[PDB]
Amino acid sequence: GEIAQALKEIAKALKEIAWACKEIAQALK
Amino acid sequence: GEIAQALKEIAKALKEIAWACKEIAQALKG
Amino acid sequence: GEIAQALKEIAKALKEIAWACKEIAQALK
Amino acid sequence: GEIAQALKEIAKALKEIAWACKEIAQALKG
Amino acid sequence: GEIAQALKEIAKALKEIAWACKEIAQALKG
Amino acid sequence: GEIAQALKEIAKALKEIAWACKEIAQALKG
Amino acid sequence: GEIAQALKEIAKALKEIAWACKEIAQALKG
């Protein structure tokens, strides 16, 4: 479904935020 | 349902963000 | 309902993000 | 409605994240 | 509608997060 | 639609968070 | 659909936050 697939895109984008926060943690290291 | 399952995927992704922020906290503690 | 329950799972995860941000604050103190 | 109430729970959780971020700013101020 | 108004509350809560993040930025300049 | 427009407001608020995070980046670079 | 496209904007806005957070990470490296 198009609504389901759009929500799936939101989920993938949140994963990008998680990765970026891991990069922040790395910078502090 | 596919909408419900996609919403759960959002929830799972959000937990990944929480864990990453905990890594930020740890990085600041070390 | 399954949608409502999934939305509640999202609220719970957002609380986990809040708690993690509190740990960042504590780490800075 | 249960969907509306669940969305309100999401709004309240986001407010907790906002408050935590204010705690971070406070921590940086001392 | 109750669902639309709940979504609007989520938007308002996200703005609260943006403001808290601006406070973080202010704290770091100071 | 009323629900669609509320979702657009959520998107706009998320963009505000993105800008606040860029402000954090600016403060650290300063 | 208008709701689906609205959700897609939300996805794009979340990506902007991710990029902004990477700017924070880069700022910490500098």
PDB file of C-alpha atoms in Angstrom:
ATOM      1  CA  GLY A   1       0.000   0.000   0.000  1.00  0.00           C
ATOM      2  CA  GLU A   2       1.083   3.553  -0.667  1.00  0.00           C
ATOM      3  CA  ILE A   3       0.387   4.679   2.930  1.00  0.00           C
ATOM      4  CA  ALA A   4       2.243   1.638   4.300  1.00  0.00           C
ATOM      5  CA  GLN A   5       5.162   2.271   1.939  1.00  0.00           C
ATOM      6  CA  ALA A   6       5.326   5.945   2.969  1.00  0.00           C
ATOM      7  CA  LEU A   7       5.507   4.896   6.637  1.00  0.00           C
ATOM      8  CA  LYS A   8       8.290   2.539   5.624  1.00  0.00           C
ATOM      9  CA  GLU A   9      10.119   5.566   4.213  1.00  0.00           C
ATOM     10  CA  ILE A  10       9.689   7.362   7.533  1.00  0.00           C
ATOM     11  CA  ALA A  11      11.188   4.348   9.296  1.00  0.00           C
ATOM     12  CA  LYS A  12      14.219   4.327   6.979  1.00  0.00           C
ATOM     13  CA  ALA A  13      14.737   8.077   7.519  1.00  0.00           C
ATOM     14  CA  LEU A  14      14.707   7.606  11.298  1.00  0.00           C
ATOM     15  CA  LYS A  15      17.430   5.022  10.811  1.00  0.00           C
ATOM     16  CA  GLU A  16      19.477   7.723   9.077  1.00  0.00           C
ATOM     17  CA  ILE A  17      19.049   9.891  12.184  1.00  0.00           C
ATOM     18  CA  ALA A  18      20.220   6.986  14.356  1.00  0.00           C
ATOM     19  CA  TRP A  19      23.321   6.558  12.190  1.00  0.00           C
ATOM     20  CA  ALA A  20      24.076  10.290  12.372  1.00  0.00           C
ATOM     21  CA  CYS A  21      23.855  10.182  16.175  1.00  0.00           C
ATOM     22  CA  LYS A  22      26.311   7.286  16.100  1.00  0.00           C
ATOM     23  CA  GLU A  23      28.584   9.600  14.075  1.00  0.00           C
ATOM     24  CA  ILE A  24      28.216  12.253  16.761  1.00  0.00           C
ATOM     25  CA  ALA A  25      29.227   9.710  19.392  1.00  0.00           C
ATOM     26  CA  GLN A  26      32.233   8.835  17.216  1.00  0.00           C
ATOM     27  CA  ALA A  27      33.299  12.465  16.904  1.00  0.00           C
ATOM     28  CA  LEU A  28      33.303  12.704  20.713  1.00  0.00           C
ATOM     29  CA  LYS A  29      35.532   9.615  20.792  1.00  0.00           C
TER      30      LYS A  29
ATOM     31  CA  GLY B   1      -1.974  -5.284   8.943  1.00  0.00           C
ATOM     32  CA  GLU B   2       0.543  -3.611   6.693  1.00  0.00           C
ATOM     33  CA  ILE B   3      -0.065  -0.140   8.155  1.00  0.00           C
ATOM     34  CA  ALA B   4       0.291  -1.498  11.703  1.00  0.00           C
ATOM     35  CA  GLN B   5       3.462  -3.333  10.694  1.00  0.00           C
ATOM     36  CA  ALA B   6       4.940  -0.194   9.142  1.00  0.00           C
ATOM     37  CA  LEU B   7       4.142   1.744  12.318  1.00  0.00           C
ATOM     38  CA  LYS B   8       5.935  -0.912  14.373  1.00  0.00           C
ATOM     39  CA  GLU B   9       8.893  -0.479  12.030  1.00  0.00           C
ATOM     40  CA  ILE B  10       8.869   3.237  12.899  1.00  0.00           C
ATOM     41  CA  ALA B  11       8.873   2.312  16.575  1.00  0.00           C
ATOM     42  CA  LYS B  12      11.792  -0.007  16.050  1.00  0.00           C
ATOM     43  CA  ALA B  13      13.736   2.732  14.216  1.00  0.00           C
ATOM     44  CA  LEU B  14      13.056   5.142  17.043  1.00  0.00           C
ATOM     45  CA  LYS B  15      14.564   2.685  19.518  1.00  0.00           C
ATOM     46  CA  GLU B  16      17.666   2.695  17.343  1.00  0.00           C
ATOM     47  CA  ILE B  17      17.826   6.455  17.836  1.00  0.00           C
ATOM     48  CA  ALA B  18      17.536   6.047  21.619  1.00  0.00           C
ATOM     49  CA  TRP B  19      20.447   3.553  21.633  1.00  0.00           C
ATOM     50  CA  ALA B  20      22.558   5.905  19.515  1.00  0.00           C
ATOM     51  CA  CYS B  21      21.925   8.784  21.930  1.00  0.00           C
ATOM     52  CA  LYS B  22      23.012   6.499  24.761  1.00  0.00           C
ATOM     53  CA  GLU B  23      26.238   6.085  22.773  1.00  0.00           C
ATOM     54  CA  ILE B  24      26.539   9.863  22.755  1.00  0.00           C
ATOM     55  CA  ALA B  25      26.123   9.872  26.541  1.00  0.00           C
ATOM     56  CA  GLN B  26      28.782   7.185  26.933  1.00  0.00           C
ATOM     57  CA  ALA B  27      31.171   9.036  24.604  1.00  0.00           C
ATOM     58  CA  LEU B  28      30.777  12.110  26.837  1.00  0.00           C
ATOM     59  CA  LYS B  29      31.330  10.007  29.962  1.00  0.00           C
ATOM     60  CA  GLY B  30      34.577   8.580  28.604  1.00  0.00           C
TER      61      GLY B  30
ATOM     62  CA  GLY C   1      -6.894  -1.822  17.778  1.00  0.00           C
ATOM     63  CA  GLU C   2      -3.713  -2.883  16.021  1.00  0.00           C
ATOM     64  CA  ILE C   3      -3.016   0.591  14.631  1.00  0.00           C
ATOM     65  CA  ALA C   4      -3.614   2.263  18.011  1.00  0.00           C
ATOM     66  CA  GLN C   5      -1.357  -0.321  19.719  1.00  0.00           C
ATOM     67  CA  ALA C   6       1.386   0.283  17.166  1.00  0.00           C
ATOM     68  CA  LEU C   7       1.078   4.034  17.764  1.00  0.00           C
ATOM     69  CA  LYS C   8       1.453   3.357  21.474  1.00  0.00           C
ATOM     70  CA  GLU C   9       4.669   1.439  20.667  1.00  0.00           C
ATOM     71  CA  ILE C  10       5.880   4.600  18.942  1.00  0.00           C
ATOM     72  CA  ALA C  11       5.106   6.711  22.038  1.00  0.00           C
ATOM     73  CA  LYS C  12       7.019   4.234  24.194  1.00  0.00           C
ATOM     74  CA  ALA C  13      10.069   4.390  21.886  1.00  0.00           C
ATOM     75  CA  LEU C  14       9.986   8.188  21.936  1.00  0.00           C
ATOM     76  CA  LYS C  15      10.107   8.005  25.738  1.00  0.00           C
ATOM     77  CA  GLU C  16      13.269   5.898  25.374  1.00  0.00           C
ATOM     78  CA  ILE C  17      14.746   8.696  23.291  1.00  0.00           C
ATOM     79  CA  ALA C  18      13.844  11.196  26.030  1.00  0.00           C
ATOM     80  CA  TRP C  19      15.525   9.044  28.656  1.00  0.00           C
ATOM     81  CA  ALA C  20      18.648   8.729  26.499  1.00  0.00           C
ATOM     82  CA  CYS C  21      18.727  12.518  26.127  1.00  0.00           C
ATOM     83  CA  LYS C  22      18.485  12.772  29.910  1.00  0.00           C
ATOM     84  CA  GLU C  23      21.562  10.576  30.145  1.00  0.00           C
ATOM     85  CA  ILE C  24      23.411  12.944  27.790  1.00  0.00           C
ATOM     86  CA  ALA C  25      22.489  15.810  30.135  1.00  0.00           C
ATOM     87  CA  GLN C  26      23.691  13.831  33.144  1.00  0.00           C
ATOM     88  CA  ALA C  27      26.943  13.006  31.325  1.00  0.00           C
ATOM     89  CA  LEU C  28      27.468  16.729  30.678  1.00  0.00           C
ATOM     90  CA  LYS C  29      26.989  17.503  34.390  1.00  0.00           C
TER      91      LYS C  29
ATOM     92  CA  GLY D   1     -11.056   7.648  19.734  1.00  0.00           C
ATOM     93  CA  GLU D   2      -8.269   5.183  20.397  1.00  0.00           C
ATOM     94  CA  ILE D   3      -6.258   6.339  17.385  1.00  0.00           C
ATOM     95  CA  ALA D   4      -6.621   9.996  18.418  1.00  0.00           C
ATOM     96  CA  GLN D   5      -5.645   9.146  22.004  1.00  0.00           C
ATOM     97  CA  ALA D   6      -2.621   7.185  20.817  1.00  0.00           C
ATOM     98  CA  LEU D   7      -1.489  10.180  18.736  1.00  0.00           C
ATOM     99  CA  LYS D   8      -1.868  12.345  21.863  1.00  0.00           C
ATOM    100  CA  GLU D   9       0.353   9.889  23.691  1.00  0.00           C
ATOM    101  CA  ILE D  10       2.912  10.416  20.937  1.00  0.00           C
ATOM    102  CA  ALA D  11       2.670  14.203  21.377  1.00  0.00           C
ATOM    103  CA  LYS D  12       3.222  13.863  25.134  1.00  0.00           C
ATOM    104  CA  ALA D  13       6.290  11.653  24.560  1.00  0.00           C
ATOM    105  CA  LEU D  14       7.737  14.252  22.168  1.00  0.00           C
ATOM    106  CA  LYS D  15       7.265  16.863  24.875  1.00  0.00           C
ATOM    107  CA  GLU D  16       9.394  14.681  27.167  1.00  0.00           C
ATOM    108  CA  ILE D  17      12.115  14.712  24.528  1.00  0.00           C
ATOM    109  CA  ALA D  18      11.866  18.505  24.346  1.00  0.00           C
ATOM    110  CA  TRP D  19      12.218  18.718  28.142  1.00  0.00           C
ATOM    111  CA  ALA D  20      15.256  16.427  28.094  1.00  0.00           C
ATOM    112  CA  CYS D  21      16.868  18.655  25.466  1.00  0.00           C
ATOM    113  CA  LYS D  22      16.277  21.624  27.782  1.00  0.00           C
ATOM    114  CA  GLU D  23      18.061  19.554  30.449  1.00  0.00           C
ATOM    115  CA  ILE D  24      20.987  19.247  28.062  1.00  0.00           C
ATOM    116  CA  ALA D  25      21.070  23.030  27.570  1.00  0.00           C
ATOM    117  CA  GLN D  26      20.913  23.479  31.364  1.00  0.00           C
ATOM    118  CA  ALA D  27      23.779  21.000  31.773  1.00  0.00           C
ATOM    119  CA  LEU D  28      25.882  23.004  29.299  1.00  0.00           C
ATOM    120  CA  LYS D  29      25.149  26.220  31.256  1.00  0.00           C
ATOM    121  CA  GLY D  30      26.078  24.546  34.532  1.00  0.00           C
TER     122      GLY D  30
ATOM    123  CA  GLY E   1     -11.419  16.336  13.445  1.00  0.00           C
ATOM    124  CA  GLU E   2     -10.016  14.574  16.493  1.00  0.00           C
ATOM    125  CA  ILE E   3      -7.318  12.761  14.490  1.00  0.00           C
ATOM    126  CA  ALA E   4      -6.198  15.882  12.636  1.00  0.00           C
ATOM    127  CA  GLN E   5      -6.115  17.851  15.932  1.00  0.00           C
ATOM    128  CA  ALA E   6      -4.012  15.149  17.561  1.00  0.00           C
ATOM    129  CA  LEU E   7      -1.573  15.381  14.610  1.00  0.00           C
ATOM    130  CA  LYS E   8      -1.493  19.120  15.103  1.00  0.00           C
ATOM    131  CA  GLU E   9      -0.531  18.513  18.767  1.00  0.00           C
ATOM    132  CA  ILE E  10       2.336  16.311  17.551  1.00  0.00           C
ATOM    133  CA  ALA E  11       3.475  19.185  15.286  1.00  0.00           C
ATOM    134  CA  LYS E  12       3.339  21.581  18.268  1.00  0.00           C
ATOM    135  CA  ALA E  13       5.363  19.130  20.382  1.00  0.00           C
ATOM    136  CA  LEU E  14       8.020  18.881  17.620  1.00  0.00           C
ATOM    137  CA  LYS E  15       8.295  22.664  17.633  1.00  0.00           C
ATOM    138  CA  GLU E  16       8.978  22.401  21.378  1.00  0.00           C
ATOM    139  CA  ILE E  17      11.900  20.093  20.516  1.00  0.00           C
ATOM    140  CA  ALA E  18      13.226  22.588  17.946  1.00  0.00           C
ATOM    141  CA  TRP E  19      13.138  25.346  20.586  1.00  0.00           C
ATOM    142  CA  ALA E  20      14.954  23.165  23.116  1.00  0.00           C
ATOM    143  CA  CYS E  21      17.587  22.434  20.462  1.00  0.00           C
ATOM    144  CA  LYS E  22      17.954  26.191  19.887  1.00  0.00           C
ATOM    145  CA  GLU E  23      18.596  26.477  23.641  1.00  0.00           C
ATOM    146  CA  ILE E  24      21.325  23.868  23.291  1.00  0.00           C
ATOM    147  CA  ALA E  25      22.913  25.972  20.526  1.00  0.00           C
ATOM    148  CA  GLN E  26      22.678  29.120  22.636  1.00  0.00           C
ATOM    149  CA  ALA E  27      24.323  27.345  25.575  1.00  0.00           C
ATOM    150  CA  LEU E  28      27.254  26.300  23.375  1.00  0.00           C
ATOM    151  CA  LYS E  29      27.838  29.836  22.050  1.00  0.00           C
ATOM    152  CA  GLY E  30      27.828  31.078  25.619  1.00  0.00           C
TER     153      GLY E  30
ATOM    154  CA  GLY F   1      -7.400  17.334   3.286  1.00  0.00           C
ATOM    155  CA  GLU F   2      -7.492  18.146   6.987  1.00  0.00           C
ATOM    156  CA  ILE F   3      -5.391  15.138   7.967  1.00  0.00           C
ATOM    157  CA  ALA F   4      -2.972  15.720   5.080  1.00  0.00           C
ATOM    158  CA  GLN F   5      -2.538  19.372   6.119  1.00  0.00           C
ATOM    159  CA  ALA F   6      -1.845  18.325   9.727  1.00  0.00           C
ATOM    160  CA  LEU F   7       0.797  15.948   8.378  1.00  0.00           C
ATOM    161  CA  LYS F   8       2.336  18.823   6.407  1.00  0.00           C
ATOM    162  CA  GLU F   9       2.544  20.797   9.670  1.00  0.00           C
ATOM    163  CA  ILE F  10       4.448  17.887  11.243  1.00  0.00           C
ATOM    164  CA  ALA F  11       6.869  17.997   8.284  1.00  0.00           C
ATOM    165  CA  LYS F  12       7.357  21.751   8.714  1.00  0.00           C
ATOM    166  CA  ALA F  13       8.051  21.371  12.437  1.00  0.00           C
ATOM    167  CA  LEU F  14      10.575  18.617  11.661  1.00  0.00           C
ATOM    168  CA  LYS F  15      12.362  21.046   9.325  1.00  0.00           C
ATOM    169  CA  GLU F  16      12.515  23.484  12.234  1.00  0.00           C
ATOM    170  CA  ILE F  17      14.301  20.825  14.293  1.00  0.00           C
ATOM    171  CA  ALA F  18      16.757  20.308  11.418  1.00  0.00           C
ATOM    172  CA  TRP F  19      17.508  24.037  11.440  1.00  0.00           C
ATOM    173  CA  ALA F  20      17.978  24.068  15.207  1.00  0.00           C
ATOM    174  CA  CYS F  21      20.445  21.181  14.858  1.00  0.00           C
ATOM    175  CA  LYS F  22      22.310  23.201  12.214  1.00  0.00           C
ATOM    176  CA  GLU F  23      22.428  25.995  14.814  1.00  0.00           C
ATOM    177  CA  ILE F  24      24.033  23.564  17.242  1.00  0.00           C
ATOM    178  CA  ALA F  25      26.582  22.739  14.537  1.00  0.00           C
ATOM    179  CA  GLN F  26      27.241  26.471  14.023  1.00  0.00           C
ATOM    180  CA  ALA F  27      27.795  27.002  17.770  1.00  0.00           C
ATOM    181  CA  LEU F  28      30.367  24.202  17.905  1.00  0.00           C
ATOM    182  CA  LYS F  29      32.150  25.601  14.851  1.00  0.00           C
ATOM    183  CA  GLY F  30      32.160  29.109  16.309  1.00  0.00           C
TER     184      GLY F  30
ATOM    185  CA  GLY G   1      -2.506  10.020  -2.515  1.00  0.00           C
ATOM    186  CA  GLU G   2      -2.366  13.232  -0.539  1.00  0.00           C
ATOM    187  CA  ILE G   3      -1.891  11.463   2.811  1.00  0.00           C
ATOM    188  CA  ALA G   4       0.867   9.256   1.371  1.00  0.00           C
ATOM    189  CA  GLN G   5       2.607  12.274  -0.166  1.00  0.00           C
ATOM    190  CA  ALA G   6       2.323  14.077   3.162  1.00  0.00           C
ATOM    191  CA  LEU G   7       4.002  11.116   4.864  1.00  0.00           C
ATOM    192  CA  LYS G   8       6.705  11.274   2.200  1.00  0.00           C
ATOM    193  CA  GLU G   9       7.368  14.926   3.137  1.00  0.00           C
ATOM    194  CA  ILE G  10       7.719  13.818   6.739  1.00  0.00           C
ATOM    195  CA  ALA G  11      10.263  11.233   5.622  1.00  0.00           C
ATOM    196  CA  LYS G  12      12.210  13.924   3.730  1.00  0.00           C
ATOM    197  CA  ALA G  13      12.153  16.272   6.724  1.00  0.00           C
ATOM    198  CA  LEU G  14      13.523  13.479   8.944  1.00  0.00           C
ATOM    199  CA  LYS G  15      16.354  13.072   6.450  1.00  0.00           C
ATOM    200  CA  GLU G  16      17.157  16.797   6.866  1.00  0.00           C
ATOM    201  CA  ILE G  17      17.505  16.188  10.597  1.00  0.00           C
ATOM    202  CA  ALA G  18      19.882  13.297   9.872  1.00  0.00           C
ATOM    203  CA  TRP G  19      22.041  15.534   7.676  1.00  0.00           C
ATOM    204  CA  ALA G  20      21.966  18.313  10.260  1.00  0.00           C
ATOM    205  CA  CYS G  21      23.083  15.823  12.924  1.00  0.00           C
ATOM    206  CA  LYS G  22      25.980  14.845  10.662  1.00  0.00           C
ATOM    207  CA  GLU G  23      26.876  18.550  10.568  1.00  0.00           C
ATOM    208  CA  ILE G  24      27.048  18.414  14.359  1.00  0.00           C
ATOM    209  CA  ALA G  25      29.320  15.353  14.125  1.00  0.00           C
ATOM    210  CA  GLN G  26      31.601  17.103  11.633  1.00  0.00           C
ATOM    211  CA  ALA G  27      31.624  20.229  13.839  1.00  0.00           C
ATOM    212  CA  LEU G  28      32.869  18.118  16.741  1.00  0.00           C
ATOM    213  CA  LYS G  29      35.700  16.793  14.553  1.00  0.00           C
ATOM    214  CA  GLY G  30      36.820  20.334  13.751  1.00  0.00           C
TER     215      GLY G  30
END
